[PDB]
Structures are given as C-alpha cells and as structure tokens.
Design a protein around this ligand. Structure first.
Ligand code: HEM
Ligand SMILES: CC1(C)[C@@H]2CC[C@@]1(C)C(=O)C2
Ligand SMILES: [C-]#N
Ligand SMILES: [K+]
Ligand SMILES: [K+]
Length: 405
C-alpha cells in the first residue's frame, strides 16, 4: 500500500516506513523506529506508507519543527490525513496564540497543583494494587497494573465511574493504534457522545472534578462553550488512558530483565527521578506531527503546502547525536536528552502527573517485589502507532522474596 510518489519529492529521500506496522517490530518498537537512524537514511525522508508523508529522523529537526508552528501547524497533527482532518481536540489541534488560553485551563486540571492535590491517592492506589498482586507470584502487568493504576487515578481526577473504563479505553486505543474496525471520526464521535450529557450535567450542577472545572472555565473573556468543553475533555480522556499505561509496561519489561538496575533504585531511591527520565528517553513512545501551512524549504528539503510531516517524539532521545549509546539504559547519564513529552507550545500538560505515577510505581513496586522476571518462554510483542505499546507482559516471581510494608 504505497501512495504514488508526489512530483516534488526526489527519489533519494524515499524511505518506506510504516508507523503503524514497522518492519522490525519483533526486535522491540523503539528498535523498529531506530532503523530510521541508520546511516542509509537521510535526516528527513518521505514514506509512501499511510497516504504519503515526511518523517524527521533527528532530534535537531524534530525540535525545530515543533517550535516553528508558523510553518508546522497542529491543525492536522495525525497521520493518516483522514484522521488528522477529523482531529479537533483542544488544545492539541490549535496553534499559538489561540491554543494559549485553553492550555491554561488544561494546566488547571492536570498540572502540578492537581498532582500535589492527588498525591496521597496516587501513592495509596499504587501500594494497594501492588500488595494485592504480591502474594500471587505472577500477574499480567498490562491488565493488572499498567492499566488500572493510571486509569483509575484519571477517572478519580475526572469524577467518572470506573465501570466506564472498558468502553473509553477501547475508543482511545482505536484513535492511537487503529484496528480498522472503525474510522478515527467514528471513534472520536463515540467519545464525544459519552462526554456530551456529562458536560451538560456538570454545567448545570458544577463539581470540583476536572470535567466540571473545564466545562465551567473562561476563555476569550466569555464562558467556554459546551462544544469547546467537549473537545478538551475528549483530549484529557485520550491523554489519561494510553501513554502512562503503555510507558509503565515498557519500563517494567526492562526492569524484569535488569536486576542491577533494580538494586540501584532500591539502595539509592534519590536516583529514582533521574531514572524516570532515562526510562522516558529509552522507552519513549509517542509519534504525531504537523501539517505544512505553505511551501517551505527545511534543511535543504522542499516541502509543499499541505504536506504532512511526522515528527516522532520518540526519536529525539534515541538520536545518537543527542545521546551516546542511545539504546543503553544508564541512570547516571550526565544529560538525559529527550522530547518524550513533546516540544514547543504543546509540550504535555500531564507531564507532572505522568512523572509522579512513574516514580511512585518504581519505588513501591521494587520495595515489595524486588525480584521478578518475564514468564518462562513468553514472547513480548510490541505495537506501534501514534502511541506505541506493549501487548501483554506476563511477570512471575517467588512470593518468598517479596515483602509487605
Ligand atoms: C509517559 C506519559 C506521557 C507521555 C509520553 C505524553 C506525551 C505527550 C506529547 C508528546 C504531547 C504533545 C503532542 C503534540 O505535540 O501534538 C502531549 C500532549 C498532551 N498531553 Fe501528554 N503524555 C503523557 C501523559 C499524560 C497524562 C497522564 C495526561 C493527563 C491528562 C496527559 C495529557 C495531555 C494533554 C492535555 C496534552 C495537550 C497539551 C497541549 O496541546 O497544549 N498526558 N503528551
Ligand atoms: C499525541 C498525544 C499523546 C497527545 C495527547 C494524547 C495524544 C494521543 C494526542 O492526541 C495529543
Ligand atoms: C498525553 N498523552
Ligand atoms: K536518518
Ligand atoms: K483537524
């Protein structure tokens, strides 16, 4: 399924990478994307896959393009085109300065102060889930912890019932890792139809939850519309239900293979925040992009108005020009360079929430279950898309080596 090579794209810039099914997925998803950084591949290439689009392969280019919203607009930030065109989430499909006032509202509901507000529930839930698994001597990490821990905290934060998780999680995954089972537009509108009655209820009777706060905030000197509220809460749903979930899996899969890395963190827990950064770099997982607002020459390459460009947040930190021996996990790296939470004006608003969930996970897991591994003979499959992930992660351990606190 290769789209005909457009006339303005020279043949030597063609590299047919499929972001939804990279050829090297078996070696691990980050490894599969890292083929874009082998010496046979230019800094900036065109793939004919998924409609045809550019991909920046180097951190330097990815950062520049994320900064230059004048040429690289968030209007259409998803490949393929049909998805990016349907995509209307707020603030993510807006450029500055329009984006600005909506993002301040986002920061109000998922930013620092909400982390410190919710920190006790976060710690509480981590300990509770881990203690429940501890005596089993096994778990499916994706389903037993990676999903429920961040997702229940998000549902708590948004004041939504946990019974709604299965339905909302399915729709979220259709947008980031599409199955072909329903169009992006259909998935979005399914999520929108769920939010619509809730937002109306919470406009008429305001609560203190994230959804009440967004639905009742101010932009442009006036009340936010029911439509805008919907477009923002939609993004919060997606933001809350896929990235941390999948990132914890990558990290725990790594730690299952790395007894010496576990001991570093257990013996010197003050290194955990730096370790969090390193895992975020090494196991980075997001890849969206931008659309050209006009013809533009970028690093010697002629881009056309309306061209889509994938600017994989995943690749910046894997770039050997940014980090020596990028595939090696080194908690003492003097500088962990990455754009895992993105870059420029859209730099993730939930990044403080993400970090706290990661750091709490690292500490509390390794405290109670310091010695564990991947199930004997199990093959771990990764999946690739706008947000990449781990399909399943069966872990095992000897309960005699675990500890309650
Ligand atoms: C490891 C975990 C996470 C990663 C890797 C991640 C990644 C990213 C990236 C790369 C962007 C920028 C997308 C773009 O430039 O178009 C973004 C935006 C955003 N994310 Fe996250 N995220 C994580 C966790 C979370 C959490 C827990 C939330 C909770 C709500 C959240 C909510 C948001 C929101 C609201 C935006 C939009 C910001 C804006 O457009 O101004 N994220 N994320
Ligand atoms: C790319 C993202 C990670 C960012 C927040 C959720 C996500 C899937 C978006 O649509 C914007
Ligand atoms: C953000 N996800
Ligand atoms: K390259
Ligand atoms: K759009």
């Amino acid at each position: 399924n290769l789209a005909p090579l457009p006339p303005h794209v020279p043949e030597h810039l063609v590299f047919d990478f499929d972001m939804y099914n990279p050829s090297n997925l078996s070696a691990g998803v980050q490894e599969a994307w890292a083929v874009l950084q082998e010496s046979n591949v230019p800094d900036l290439v065109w793939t004919r896959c998924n409609g045809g689009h550019w991909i920046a392969t180097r951190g330097q280019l990815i950062r520049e393009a994320y900064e230059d919203y004048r040429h690289f607009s968030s209007e259409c930030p998803f490949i393929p085109r049909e998805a990016g065109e349907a995509y209307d989430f707020i603030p993510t499909s807006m450029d500055p300065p329009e984006q600005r006032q909506f993002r301040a509202l986002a920061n109000q509901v998922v930013g620092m102060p909400v982390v410190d507000k919710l920190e006790n529930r976060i710690q509480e839930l981590a300990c509770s889930l881990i203690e429940s698994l501890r005596p089993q001597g096994q778990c499916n990490f994706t389903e037993d912890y990676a999903e429920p821990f961040p997702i229940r905290i998000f549902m708590l934060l948004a004041g939504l019932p946990e019974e709604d998780i299965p339905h909302l999680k399915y729709l979220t995954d259709q947008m980031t890792r599409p199955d072909g089972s329903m169009t992006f537009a259909e998935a979005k509108e399914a999520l929108y139809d769920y939010l619509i009655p809730i937002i109306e209820q919470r406009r008429q009777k305001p609560g203190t939850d994230a959804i009440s706060i967004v639905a009742n905030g101010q932009v442009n000197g006036r009340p936010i519309t029911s439509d805008e509220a919907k477009r923002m809460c939609g993004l919060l749903l997606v933001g809350g239900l896929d990235t941390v979930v999948n990132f914890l899996s990558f990290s725990m899969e790594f730690l299952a293979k790395s007894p010496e890395h576990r001991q570093e963190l257990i013996e010197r827990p003050e290194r955990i925040p730096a370790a969090c950064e390193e895992l975020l770099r090494r196991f980075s997982l997001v890849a969206d992009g931008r659309i050209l607002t006009s013809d533009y020459e970028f690093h010697g390459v002629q881009l056309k108005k309306g061209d889509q460009i994938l600017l994989p947040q995943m690749l910046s930190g894997l770039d050997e020009r940014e980090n020596a021996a990028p595939m090696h996990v080194d908690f003492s790296r003097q500088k962990v360079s990455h754009t895992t939470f993105g870059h420029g004006s859209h730099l993730c608003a939930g990044q403080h929430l993400a970090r706290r969930e990661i750091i709490v996970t690292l500490k509390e897991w390794l405290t109670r279950i310091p010695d564990f591994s991947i199930a004997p003979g199990a093959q771990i499959q990764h999946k690739s898309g706008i947000v990449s992930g781990v399909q399943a992660l069966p872990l095992v351990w000897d309960p005699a080596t675990t500890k309650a606190v």
